[PDB]
Amino acid sequence: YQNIFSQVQVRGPADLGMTEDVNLANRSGVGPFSTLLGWFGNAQLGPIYLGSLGVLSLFSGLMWFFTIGIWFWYQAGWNPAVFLRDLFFFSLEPPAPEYGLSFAAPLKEGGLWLIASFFMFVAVWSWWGRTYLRAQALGMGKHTAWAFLSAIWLWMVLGFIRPILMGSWSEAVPYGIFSHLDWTNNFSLVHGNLFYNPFHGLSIAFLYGSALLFAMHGATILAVSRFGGERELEQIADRGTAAERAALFWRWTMGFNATMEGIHRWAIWMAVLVTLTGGIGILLSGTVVDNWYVWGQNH
Amino acid sequence: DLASLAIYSFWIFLAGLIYYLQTENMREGYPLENEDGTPAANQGPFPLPKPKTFILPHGRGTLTVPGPESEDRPIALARTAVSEGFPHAPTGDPMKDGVGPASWVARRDLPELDGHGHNKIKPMKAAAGFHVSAGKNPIGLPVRGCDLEIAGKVVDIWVDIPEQMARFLEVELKDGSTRLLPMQMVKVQSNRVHVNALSSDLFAGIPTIKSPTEVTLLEEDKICGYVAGGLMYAAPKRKSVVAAML
Amino acid sequence: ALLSFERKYRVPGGTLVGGNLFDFWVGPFYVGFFGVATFFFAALGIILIAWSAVLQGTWNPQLISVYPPALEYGLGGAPLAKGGLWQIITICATGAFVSWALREVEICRKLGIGYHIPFAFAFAILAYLTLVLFRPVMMGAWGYAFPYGIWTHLDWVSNTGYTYGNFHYNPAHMIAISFFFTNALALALHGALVLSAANPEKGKEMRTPDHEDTFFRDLVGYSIGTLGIHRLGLLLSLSAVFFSALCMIITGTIWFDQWVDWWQWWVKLPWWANIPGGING
Numbered sequence: 001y002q003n004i005f006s007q008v009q010v011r012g013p014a015d016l017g018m019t020e021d022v023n024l025a026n027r028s029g030v031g032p033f034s035t036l037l038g039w040f041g042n043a044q045l046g047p048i049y050l051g052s053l054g055v056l057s058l059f060s061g062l063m064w065f066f067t068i069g070i071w072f073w074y075q076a077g078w079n080p081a082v083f084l085r086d087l088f089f090f091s092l093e094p095p096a097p098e099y100g101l102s103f104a105a106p107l108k109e110g111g112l113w114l115i116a117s118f119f120m121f122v123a124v125w126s127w128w129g130r131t132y133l134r135a136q137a138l139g140m141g142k143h144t145a146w147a148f149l150s151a152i153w154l155w156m157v158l159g160f161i162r163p164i165l166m167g168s169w170s171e172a173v174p175y176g177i178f179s180h181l182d183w184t185n186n187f188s189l190v191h192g193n194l195f196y197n198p199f200h201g202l203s204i205a206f207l208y209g210s211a212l213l214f215a216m217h218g219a220t221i222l223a224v225s226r227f228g229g230e231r232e233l234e235q236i237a238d239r240g241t242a243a244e245r246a247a248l249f250w251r252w253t254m255g256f257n258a259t260m261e262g263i264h265r266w267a268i269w270m271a272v273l274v275t276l277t278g279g280i281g282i283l284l285s286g287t288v289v290d291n292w293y294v295w296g297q298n299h
Numbered sequence: 300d301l302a303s304l305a306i307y308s309f310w311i312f313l314a315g316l317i318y319y320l321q322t323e324n325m326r327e328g329y330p331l332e333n334e335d336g337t338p339a340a341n342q343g344p345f346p347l348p349k350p351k352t353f354i355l356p357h358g359r360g361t362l363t364v365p366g367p368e369s370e371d372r373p374i375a376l377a378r379t380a381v382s383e384g385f386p387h388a389p390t391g392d393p394m395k396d397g398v399g400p401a402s403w404v405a406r407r408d409l410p411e412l413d414g415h416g417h418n419k420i421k422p423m424k425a426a427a428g429f430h431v432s433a434g435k436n437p438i439g440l441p442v443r444g445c446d447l448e449i450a451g452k453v454v455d456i457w458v459d460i461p462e463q464m465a466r467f468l469e470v471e472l473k474d475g476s477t478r479l480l481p482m483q484m485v486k487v488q489s490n491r492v493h494v495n496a497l498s499s500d501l502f503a504g505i506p507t508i509k510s511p512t513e514v515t516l517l518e519e520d521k522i523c524g525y526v527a528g529g530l531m532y533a534a535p536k537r538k539s540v541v542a543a544m545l
Numbered sequence: 546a547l548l549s550f551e552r553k554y555r556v557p558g559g560t561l562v563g564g565n566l567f568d569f570w571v572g573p574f575y576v577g578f579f580g581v582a583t584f585f586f587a588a589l590g591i592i593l594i595a596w597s598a599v600l601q602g603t604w605n606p607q608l609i610s611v612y613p614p615a616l617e618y619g620l621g622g623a624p625l626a627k628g629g630l631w632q633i634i635t636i637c638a639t640g641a642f643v644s645w646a647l648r649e650v651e652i653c654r655k656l657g658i659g660y661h662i663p664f665a666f667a668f669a670i671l672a673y674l675t676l677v678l679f680r681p682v683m684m685g686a687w688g689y690a691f692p693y694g695i696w697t698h699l700d701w702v703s704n705t706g707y708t709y710g711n712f713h714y715n716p717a718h719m720i721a722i723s724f725f726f727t728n729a730l731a732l733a734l735h736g737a738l739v740l741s742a743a744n745p746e747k748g749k750e751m752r753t754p755d756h757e758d759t760f761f762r763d764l765v766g767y768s769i770g771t772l773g774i775h776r777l778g779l780l781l782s783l784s785a786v787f788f789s790a791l792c793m794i795i796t797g798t799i800w801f802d803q804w805v806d807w808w809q810w811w812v813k814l815p816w817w818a819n820i821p822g823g824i825n826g
C-alpha cells in the first residue's frame with residue numbers, strides 16, 4: 001500500500017468550517033460529496049464564501065470570458081459547428097501598433113481586446129484582494145496573497161506593464177489557444193532567442209525545481225504518512241518521528257535537510273521565483289535588450 | 300547596463316535567500332552533536348537563527364525554537380566502532396526499546412485537537428454520523444500478519460473527523476483486547492486485512508492506549524513507530540510472496 | 546556530526562548489497578554499496594568529461610561539450626573523441642543515477658519509511674534515458690541524443706524543436722506544460738497555506754489544519770486536504786515528466802512533420818471539415 005489512493009472512504013456530517021472573524025452570512029451552503037474526489041482527497045464540495053469582492057471578481061471574470069466568446073462566435077459566423085472545429089484557431093487580437101496606447105481602436109480592431117483586458121484586470125485584482133481578506137478573517141498570515149502577487153507580476157508584465165513601457169497595446173498577448181502560443185514563439189524569435197535571456201534560464205531552473213521539490217516533498221510526506229506525516233502543523237508544534245525520519249532521509253542522502261515548517265519556505269520560494277524571475281526577464285525584453293544573443297556576447 | 304545590474308543583484312539576493320532558508324531550517328535538530336551526545340566541533344557555516352515562539356491553542360502553552368533538545372529518554376543502543384560514522388547496535392529488543400526504524404518521539408501525551416478544541420481522531424463507533432462511504436468496509440474482517448497467521452479482527456475504524464478519513468483500524472486480539480493499526484500500513488482485501496509489517500506474534504506487543512475513546516500523539520508515535528519497525532525486525536518471520544500467493 | 550535526535554536512528558541494517566560492509570556514514574552522508582557505486586560512476590564520468598575537455602582544447606565550463614556519435618555511426622560504437630567518449634559518460638551517468646536511487650532505497654529501509662522518493666526519482670531518470678537512449682535507439686542513431694554542455698544542450702533543444710516548426714504544437718508537450726505550470730501553482734499554494742496557518746497574524750495562536758481547509762473552501766469552494774495536497778504535488782510532478790518523455794519519444798519516430806499540422810485531424814473531421822467560414826473555412 002503506497003497511500004496514493006485511499007483504500008476505504010469514510011464520511012460524516014459536512015464541515016461548515018472555522019468561524020473566526022468571517023461573515024458567516026456570506027458563506028454558501030455545503031455542496032455535494034464526490035466519492036470520486038474522495039479517493040484522492042476530500043469528498044466534500046463547498047461551502048464557498050462569496051462577499052462583494054468575490055461577486056465582482058466572478059462577474060468580471062465571466063464578462064472577460066464572454067467578451068472573448070462573443071468575438072469567437074462572430075469569427076465562427078454564429079455557426080456552432082465552425083465554432084467547435086476552429087475553437088483553437090480563433091483569436092482576440094490587441095490593437096494594431098498605429099493605435100499606440102489609446103482606447104480609440106474600433107471594436108473589431110482591438111477595442112474588444114481592450115474591453116476583455118479590462119474585465120480580466122478587474123477579475124484578477126479583485127480575486128487577489130479576496131485571497132488577502134479571506135485570510136485576514138481567519139487571522140492567518142498573508143502568504144497566499146504574496147505568492148499570488150508573484151504570479152500576477154508575470155501576467156501584469158505581459159499584458160500591461162511591458163506594452164505600456166513600449167507605448168503600444170499591440171505588444172500584448174492575444175486571447176486565443178493557438179495564437180497565444182504563436183505570440184510566445186514569435187516573442188523569442190524577435191528578441192534573439194530567449195535561451196540567452198539569463199532570467200529565462202533562471203525561470204526554467206525554478207520551474208523544473210518546483211517539480212523536483214514537490215516530487216521530493218510530496219513523496220517524503222507520503223513516505224512518512226505511516227507516522228501521521230501530512231499533519232504538518234502539529235508536527236511543527238510538536239516534532240514527531242515523522243519529521244525526524246523525513247529529515248534524516250535527506251540528511252543521509254544529500255548531506256542536509258529541512259524542518260517540517262522550513263520545507264514550506266523552500267517550497268513557496270521555489271515556486272514564487274518562477275514567475276518572479278520570469279517577469280523580470282520579459283520586462284527587460286525589448287525595452288532594455290533587443291537581442292539576448294547580442295546581449296550575451298557582451299557579458 | 301540595466302539587465303546586467305539586475306542579474307548581478309539577483310544572485311546577491313538568491314545567496315541571501317538561501318542563507319535565510321537554511322538557518323530557518325535549523326529550528327530543530329541543532330546544534331549538531333558527536334555520536335556521544337556532546338556538542339560537535341563543526342557546526343557548519345550557517346549559524347542558528349534567533350528564537351521564535353509559537354503560541355499553541357487550548358492551553359497547550361508555547362513552543363520556542365531553536366531550544367534545548369527535548370529528547371531525553373534512554374536510547375538502547377551501543378557504539379560499534381571506535382571511529383565515528385558507524386552503526387550503533389541495539390542493546391536489547393529494538394522493537395520494545397523504540398530505536399532504529401522502530402523509533403518514536405516523546406510527543407505531547409494529549410490527543411491532537413481540531414479547530415474547535417475537540418479530539419481530531421475518534422473511533423467511528425463514537426463519531427456521530429460517520430460511516431464507510433466507499434470501498435470495502437474493513438470492519439469485521441480478520442487480520443493476517445506477514446507470517447500468514449490471523450492476528451485478530453477489525454472491530455472499528457478510527458477516523459480523522461476534520462479530514463473525514465480512516466486513520467487507524469482497531470484490531471481485537473485473541474485475549475479480547477485491541478490495538479490500533481495505522482491505515483497506511485494495512486491492505487484491505489475482499490476477505491481480510493493484511494499487515495505486511497508484522498507477524499501475528501507481534502500484535503500483542505503493539506503499544507496500547509490509556510483511554511478506549513481517544514489516542515494521544517505520544518501513543519500514535521509509539522504505535523506507528525512500532526509497526527513500521529516490523530519491516531526490518533520481523534523480516535525473519537515474513538513469509539515469501541509465493542507462499543502468500545497460495 | 547548528528548542532529549540532536551539522530552543517534553537512535555543510526556542503526557545497522559537496511560542494505561541490499563554487502564551486508565554490513567558499507568553500512569556506515571561519512572559526516573552526514575550515508576554510504577552503502579550504492580554509495581560507493583555512485584562515487585565510482587560519478588568520478589569516472591566526470592573524469593571522462595575532463596578528458597573530453599582536453600581533446601576539445603578547453604577548461605571553461607561554458608564551453609566544454611561532449612557530443613554523441615554522428616548520424617553516420619548509427620547505433621554502433623564510435624571513436625572516443627568522435628562520439629565514443631559520450632557513450633561511456635552516458636553509461637556512467639545512468640549508473641550513477643540508478644545507484645543514487647538504489648542508495649535511497651537502502652536509506653528508506655534503514656529508516657522504515659516508504660519508497661516514494663526513489664520511485665519518484667526514477668521518473669527523472671526515465672526522462673533522461675528517453676532522450677539519450679530510447680529515442681536515439683528508436684530513431685536509429687546516437688546522434689539524435691543531446692550533447693553534454695551547458696549551452697550546447699540548449700542549442701540542441703532549440704534545433705530539435707524547430708525541426709518540427711514551433712514545438713508548442715506537440716499535443717503531449719502541451720499537456721506536459723500544463724502539469725509543470727499547475728505543479729508550480731500548487732507548490733506555491735501549499736507552501737503559503739501551511740505557512741499562513743503556522744504563522745498567523747502577530748500575537749495570534751497557531752492556526753489548525755481546519756483553518757487551512759476553511760481558507761481554501763472560502764476561497765474556491767474546495768479543500769483537497771493535507772493528504773491530498775501531497776498526493777497531488779507528486780502526481781502533477783510525475784505527470785509533467787511523464788508527458789515530457791512521451792512528447793519526445795513520439796517525435797521523429799511516429800511523427801515527422803510540422804507539429805502544427807497534426808491538428809488538421811480535428812479540423813478535417815467529416816461533419817464540419819467542409820463548412821465554409823471561420824478560420825479554416
Ligand code: BCL
Nearest residue numbers: 200201202204205206208209212591673691695696698702
Ligand atoms: C529537460 C529538457 C532538456 C533541457 C533543457 C533546459 C533548458 C531549456 C534550460 C535548462 C537549464 C539547465 N539544465 Mg537542462 N535540459 C536537459 C537535461 C539536463 C540534464 C540531464 C542530466 O538530463 C542536466 C543535468 C541539465 C542541467 C541544466 C542546468 C545546468 C540548468 C538549470 C537546471 C535546473 O535548475 O534544474 C532544476 C534543478 C535544480 C534546481 C537542482 C539543481 C541542479 C543543478 C543546478 C544542475 C547542475 C548541472 C551540472 C552543471 C551538469 C553537469 C554535472 C557535473 C558537473 C558533471 N539539463 C534536457 C535535454 N535545461 C537552464 C539553463 O540555465 O541552461 C543553461 C535552461 O534554461
Ligand code: BCL
Nearest residue numbers: 151152154155184185187188200203204207278279281282
Ligand atoms: C519558442 C518559445 C521560446 C520561449 C518563450 C517564452 C516566453 C515569451 C515567455 C516564456 C516564459 C517561460 N518559459 Mg520559455 N520559451 C522557450 C523555451 C522554454 C523551454 C524549453 C525549450 O524547454 C522551457 C522549459 C521554458 C520554460 C518557461 C517558463 C520557466 C516560463 C513561464 C513561467 C510560468 O509559469 O508561466 C505561467 C504563468 C503565468 C502566465 C501567470 C498566470 C497568472 C495570472 C494571474 C493567471 C490568471 C488566470 C485567469 C484568470 C484565467 C483562468 C482562470 C480559471 C479560474 C482557471 N521555455 C522558447 C525558446 N518563454 C515566460 C517567462 O517568464 O519568460 C522569462 C514568458 O513570458
Ligand code: BCL
Nearest residue numbers: 669670672673702703705706711712713721722789790793
Ligand atoms: C525552441 C524549443 C521549443 C521546445 C522544444 C523542446 C524539446 C526539443 C524538448 C522539450 C522539452 C520540454 N519542454 Mg519544450 N519547447 C519550447 C517551449 C516550451 C515552453 C514554453 C513556455 O514555451 C515550455 C514551458 C516548455 C516545456 C517543456 C518541458 C515539458 C520539457 C522539459 C522538461 C523535462 O523533460 O524534464 C525531464 C527531466 C530531465 C531529463 C532531468 C533528468 C535529471 C537526471 C536524472 C539527474 C541529473 C543529476 C545531475 C547530473 C546532478 C549534478 C550534481 C549536483 C550536485 C546536482 N517548452 C520551444 C517551442 N521542449 C524536453 C522533453 O520533453 O524532454 C523529455 C525536450 O527534449
Ligand SMILES: CC[C@H]1c2cc3[nH]c4c(c3C)C(=O)[C@H](C(=O)OC)c4c3nc(cc4[nH]c(cc(n2)[C@@H]1C)c(C(C)=O)c4C)[C@@H](C)[C@@H]3CCC(=O)OC/C=C(\C)CCC[C@H](C)CCC[C@H](C)CCCC(C)C
Nearest residue numbers: 208211212215587590638641645665666668669693695786
Ligand atoms: C521526475 C520528476 C522531477 C524530479 C524528481 C527528483 N529528482 C531527484 C529526486 C526526485 C524525486 C531525488 O530524490 C534526487 C535528489 O536527491 O534530489 C535532491 C533527485 C535529483 N535530481 C537532480 C537534478 C535534476 N532533477 C531534474 C528534474 C526532475 N527531478 C523532475 C522535474 C532536473 C532538471 C534539469 O529538470 C535536474 C538537473 C539531482 C540534483 C538529484 C540527483 C543526484 C544524483 O543523481 O546524484 C548522482 C550523480 C552525481 C553526483 C554526478 C554524476 C555526474 C555525471 C556522470 C555527469 C554526466 C553529464 C550529464 C548526463 C549531462 C550534464 C550536462 C547538462 C548541462 C546537460
Ligand SMILES: CCCCCCCCCCCC[N+](C)(C)[O-]
Nearest residue numbers: 142143146147149150153268272
Ligand atoms: C511582486 C511579487 C513579489 C512577491 C514576493 C512574495 C514571496 C512570498 C514570500 C512568503 C513570505 C511571506 N512573509 C512575508 C509573510 O513572510
Ligand SMILES: CCCCCCCCCCCC[N+](C)(C)[O-]
Nearest residue numbers: 158159172173174175176177180
Ligand atoms: C477561451 C480562450 C481563452 C484564451 C486562453 C489564452 C490566454 C492567454 C492570455 C494572455 C493574457 C493576454 N494579455 C493581457 C497578457 O495580453
Ligand SMILES: CCCCCCCCCCCC[N+](C)(C)[O-]
Nearest residue numbers: 197198199200201202205209270
Ligand atoms: C532555491 C532554489 C535554488 C535553485 C538555483 C538553481 C541555479 C541554476 C541556474 C542555472 C541558470 C542561470 N543562468 C541563466 C544564468 O545560466
Ligand SMILES: [Cl-]
Nearest residue numbers: 141143740744
Ligand atoms: Cl512568516
Ligand SMILES: [Fe+2]
Nearest residue numbers: 217221232739
Ligand atoms: Fe507539506
